[PDB]
Write a protein that binds this ligand. Structure first.
Ligand code: GLU
Length: 297
């Protein structure tokens, strides 16, 4: 096809990557004049910066990060430096904050992370921002950690396996390959995140919702873990034409069955009505047209 669209995602072993890869496949197989490809990246912040720079046309990103970027606030990457070019295409599924600790590492709560070697997320990840915020809720900062490691998901679980890291954060949909792998190769435990503590700073970071990771989701973790979650979204540049986005939406979301087959999180959590519910940034004109046509707006 002649209109090229690159979709920013995340680590190859996270959920954004397989989802973006699946979306690109649906668009390319539709033969509608669009040539799409998914790019692995550090995550939400890197993706939004790439769209702002005109390097990516679309990307997956957390709703909280998208809001901070659009409004130009809350986090260093966007404080006083708004990215008004991003638009929402659809809300997708919940991204849960996973706090994974090696057993016998002396870590039972977030407070125990003080002095430990922790993988806080990849460079340019939304994960790193959530990690800083959660630590703040417990009165800590990255300077209280023994080491704040920033690497990809694959690299992070390798460090855990080799005992070069004691804990790892990952804001990601349930069932992420990286987390499943980590649980299978290493004796781990999931650290809970107290919603009440998070609520104490909800005025600064208002997007967290309570979420329970069901016991048995990951190998060796049979107890349910109370934590928090944000929402994964598909975003795009306002520079894309209304018709390009519309055509794209039809090829991707036109056949819900085919779309949900891309990943278990979509099959489990995706819905057209929820796709336009409580968005943090404006909908792209082409998406608005699609949803109106679908009778959702
Ligand atoms: N939400 C994560 C990425 C999760 C994923 O790759 O599935 C981030 O922005 O860092």
């Amino acid at each position: 096809a002649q209109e090229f669209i690159t979709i920013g995602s995340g680590s190859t072993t996270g959920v954004y990557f397989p989802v973006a890869t699946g979306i690109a496949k649906l668009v390319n197989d539709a033969n509608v004049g669009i040539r799409a490809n998914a790019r692995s990246t550090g995550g939400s912040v890197a993706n939004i910066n790439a769209i702002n720079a005109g390097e990516f046309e679309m990307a997956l990103a957390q709703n909280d990060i998208a809001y901070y970027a659009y409004q130009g606030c809350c986090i260093p990457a966007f404080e006083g430096k708004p990215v008004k070019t991003i638009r929402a295409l659809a809300a997708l599924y919940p991204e849960v904050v996973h706090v994974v600790a090696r057993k016998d590492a002396g870590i039972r709560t977030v407070a125990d992370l003080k002095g430990k070697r922790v993988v806080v997320g990849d460079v340019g990840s939304g994960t790193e921002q959530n990690a800083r915020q959660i630590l703040e809720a417990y009165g800590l900062t990255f300077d209280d950690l023994g080491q704040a490691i920033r690497v990809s998901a694959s690299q992070g679980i390798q460090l855990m396996q080799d005992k070069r890291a004691d804990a790892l954060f990952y804001t990601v949909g349930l069932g992420a390959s990286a987390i499943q792998q980590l649980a299978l190769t290493t004796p781990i435990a999931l650290v809970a995140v107290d919603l009440n503590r998070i609520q104490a700073i909800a005025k600064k970071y208002p997007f967290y919702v309570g979420f329970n990771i069901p016991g048995g989701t990951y190998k060796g973790v049979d107890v349910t873990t109370p934590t928090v979650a944000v929402q994964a979204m598909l975003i795009a540049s306002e520079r894309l034409s209304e018709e390009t986005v519309y055509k794209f939406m039809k090829a991707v979301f036109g056949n819900l069955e085919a779309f949900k087959k891309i990943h278990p999180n979509l099959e489990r959590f995706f819905g057209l009505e929820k796709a336009v519910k409580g968005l943090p940034i404006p909908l792209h004109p082409g998406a608005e047209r699609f949803y109106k046509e679908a009778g959702v707006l």
